[PDB]
Structure formats: structure tokens, C-alpha cells
Subunit: 331 residues, 2 copies
Amino acid sequence: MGETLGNRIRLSEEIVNRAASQAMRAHNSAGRPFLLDKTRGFAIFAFAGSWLSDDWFTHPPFGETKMDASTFPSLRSVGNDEVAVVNASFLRRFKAILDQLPLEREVQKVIADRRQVVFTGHSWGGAMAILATLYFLEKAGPNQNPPRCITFGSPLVGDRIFGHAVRREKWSDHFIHFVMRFDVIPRIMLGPASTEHQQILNFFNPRSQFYREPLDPPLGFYLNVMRSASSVAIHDACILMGCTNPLLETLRNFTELSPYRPFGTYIFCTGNGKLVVLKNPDAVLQILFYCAQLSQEEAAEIAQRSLHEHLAYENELQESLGMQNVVYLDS
Amino acid sequence: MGETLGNRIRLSEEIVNRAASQAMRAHNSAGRPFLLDKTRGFAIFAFAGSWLSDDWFTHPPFGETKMDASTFPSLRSVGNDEVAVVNASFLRRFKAILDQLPLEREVQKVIADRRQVVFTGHSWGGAMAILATLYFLEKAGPNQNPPRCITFGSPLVGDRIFGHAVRREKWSDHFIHFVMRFDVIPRIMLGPASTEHQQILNFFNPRSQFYREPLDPPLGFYLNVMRSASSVAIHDACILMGCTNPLLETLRNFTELSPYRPFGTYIFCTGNGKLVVLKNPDAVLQILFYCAQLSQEEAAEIAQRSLHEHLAYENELQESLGMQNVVYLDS
């Protein structure tokens, strides 16, 4: 009733909180890639994250490949246009879930059971949730309600063409991505694979919280991530102002920039229980850097702070959704 | 003859090189704020730089004030619009030159002598050259050829309204600002006054080159400058995408951002004798960060590199203007 976020995104606050809880429970669950949670009128498929570097980068610097035109036909480029680009490890792992597990049959079963389908994931798990949603959008029958995707601190998945295709097919609003202010994982794929990416993953792996000795984060990982985020944001700003790709390559001395870009509806948790909702992908890229800038020193502080925020989506949304202070930028 | 940069900016290569040489000679010249160099058909007024912090910031964080509406009437805002903003120390020091020295009479004398007037300056001296040019544009008689301004590694001087007023009066093309790729001084006013600004100035003061002991640069000064440059560039990108000022203040948690913005024609020296010319002020702000990004580590390297580039405008332009490889972004 009244003006709530749940009305704007057409997902109740109860199910978003449920999705956050299931997403954290899915991690490190006896090797299983997903769990299914059934509640009245809903089926939540929550995908476990992976903290193996090979599951993030098939090859450095960006681990990208062509989006599978057979599996996702609607995301194809018209004619000989540049093809949509996806993280190769993400796609490989999602395809393995489909091939090895009866995911599609279980999705058809809950739909036939009159349940709304929600794919959800935290961290790497959000990439599986994103690919699952696109796959079942591709194969849906005519009178099936569209699946929804909710991610928490998820990495980026696709490039600009990928995102443009999702928007073109009118699928972008089905995706809701929560991003904490200082969570680096939504930003980390804007930079090349760090030589210490595995050590970054170990630090952000929830199982590391139970270790007797605390794992140390690699020195300067946060600002190294934010330098790349600003590089990609300012690159796209130059493109939108008329600069050409060859010229920009000369200006930056021909270094490689990340191809990945945000898509879908983003919800930034900006602190003091405030939420900022926006859909424009160009604005999301700018704000991924803009809201994550640091004050004071935060040299020996941001590491623990970024980890806490990456792991605190449950508590943050319990508070921010129960007592709402939400602003919409393109609504 | 043919296609040259001198034809595009209507200033011969000979006089640009002359201006660079006079700008470096003006520094630390027996306390005098400027020198006058006369050659056939020209009068170059070169202004000495100041490496006293009080001459850069009257008050932290940005040392800004209202542009003097009496002295520069054409830069005034229509009615009760927001007024043009200038560096207070820069304006105070330029006014002192006019009041204490016969600058205006000497300018009238060379003009009556059928000499083209060029105001030039390196580093802080470029700010004096900029204000001198605007002042004499304001007071010019009807048949006097417009004065020209050439700066080398100059700090920013005015805000967006200031720059918009210069463009509105059709004066922007009279200004030529050379910027080396890794020279921090064109970027430094995009961030708040460092607590070690005086130590930054000591490091970039040319007289420091003769010291027996080498002055050490303050740790991390370069990346601290570039973090602010990216912050301001991405702020303006968000504005150009529809974000409002109150919203952006909440996103960055209400920190103060620098008001200063580039204006005039910029020429970036991008390496290998290449020059990149552009006039769009929004693109200049983006490129101030974009072309200055660092590879490898450059932890104990960029300090010496940035200093060398700030002090190498003479040699760079001798080579880049004699054998030209120039690209124009908005021409």
C-alpha cells in the first residue's frame, strides 16, 4: 500500500529480504550450485558463489568471449554487427549447471505450480542468477509470468552490446541489482585481472570469516579497483562527448580497458538506510565510482569496511526496506 | 604555408616557441612580476610564477571568490544569476600588478607601436597571463587587434560560469593552454588545498633544481591529484546525464568539490611529438584525467616524471612544432 519500493519494482519487500537470506545460505552448501526455496506463491533459486579465480577469468586481462548465439538468440546483433560479449567463465559455469542438473525441469515444475520464479545470487552467485534469468526469458512460453532476478554485490557480466540487447528486448526491468556503497565486487570487473585476484577472493569468501587467523587483504586492492572504475567511466563520458575510439586509445597510450558494463535496475545502498534507484546504464557506470570515494585516509580501514559491506546485504535491506527512504533518478 | 597548427590558432610557431622561452626566463627575475620582450611585430609580456602557497589559496579548501564585476564587466552574470567565480589569490595578485606597475600604459604603447600583444606564463605565471588578457579585452578600443594568451602548465583559474562568460563574449579562442600529459599543475586546482601544498610548490619551483640536496616530493601527491581530477570529471558527467546537485551531494556524502574548470583552447602534448587540440571545455575536463593515467607502478617514478614534464615545455614544443603531428577534436 502507498508508495513503496516493492510497488515500483513489482517485487514485495518480503521476497527481496527472503532472496537476500537465501543468497547467503546458498554459498558453500555441500558443493551444490543452487538451492530452491519455496514459499507461498514463489520459487527462489539461489546460486552459490565461487571464490576460485579460474571461475572469474578464463584468460587475462578480462576473460571475455562472444555470447552464445545458440543459447541466447534474442541477444544477437542484427546481421554482421558487433556481437554481444560475456564473461567466458560465467557462461561456461552456467551452461554446466543446465547440462548436469535438472534446472530447466525444476523451473517448469514451479511455474506449472503457479509460483513466481526468482533467480537470486550474492557475489559470483549473482552472475549465475543473471544468466539463468536470460535463459528462461529466451525459452518462456506465451502465458508464463516473466522470471525476476535479484543480485547482491554481484560482478558485472556483459559488455555494452550485451546490455543494449537486454534493454532492446524489454528485459532490463526484470533485473534488480543491489550495490553497497563501498563493495568492490560490483566494481572489480571494470579493471583487468589482478595478479592477486585469488587473494582478493579469499578475503571476500564468507568461509574465511571462521578462520582462526585473519586473512590479510592484498595491499591497495580497493584504490586499484576504483582507479579502473574511474578510467572506464571517463572513457564512456568521452565517447558520449564525440571522442573516437582510435583517438582515445592514443590518449591513454593504447592500454586495454575493460569491456564490461552495468545493465538492469540498480539500487545503491548509500548509508543511513537510504536507497537510490536508477535504470540508465550510463549513469550507473558513473555512480559506481562516484558514490564509492573515500575520505580521511582509509588506508588500513577500507579493506575491512569493503568486506563488511559486501557481506551485510541481509541486515542492510532488513532495515532499509522496513523503513524506507528511497529516491528514483529516472522515474 | 600548408596545414600547420600556427594557421589554426593564428599564432606562428616562431612566436609560440618565443613565448615558451620568455615564460621560463620570467621566473625568479629580481622580484619583477613580468618582463617585456619585443621582436618584429610582437610584444610578449611574460609573467613570473609564484611558489608561495598564499599566492595559490587565500583560504582552504579552494580559495575562490567572486570575479570582480567592476574590473571585468563583460564576465558578469545577467541579472541575479550566479556570479562568476575566480581564484582569489590570482585576482588579488593581478590587481596588484596593475595598481603598482605601469602595465596598462606599456600595453597601450606597444599597440600604438603596431605590435601584436601576447601575454604568456608558465605555471602560476599563466594565471597572471590569463587575467591580463581578459582585462585588456575588456578595455580595448575598437580597432585594436585582440591580445593573445599562451600558457604552459598553468593552473586552472575560473569556474564554469567564468568559462561560460568567456565563451559567450567570443573570447575563448584567444587563449591557448599547453598541457603535458603527466604535468600535475594543470590538474592540481581540481582538488582541495593539500596540507603539503607548499612542499608541492617547492618541488616544482625551478630554483629548486640548483639545490645541492634534492628536495623530496610529498608522498603520493600525484595520485592524490588525479583522484580529485577524476572526481570532478565524473561529477560533471553525472550533471550532463541529468543528476541533480542535491542528489550528487548525498551520493558522495556531502564532501566539497572544486569549482574550477578549464576554458579556452587546450593543446595536450601526448608524447612522441604528438599534439591534441580541443576547445570543448567538457571534453577538456575529461581528458585532463584520461591522458594522465599511469602504468607499471610509477610509485617512485611519477614524481620525477611529472616534474620533468612541467619544466620541459620549451624542448617539447621546439620538437613538436618544427615537425608536426597534430589532431583536432572539434575542428
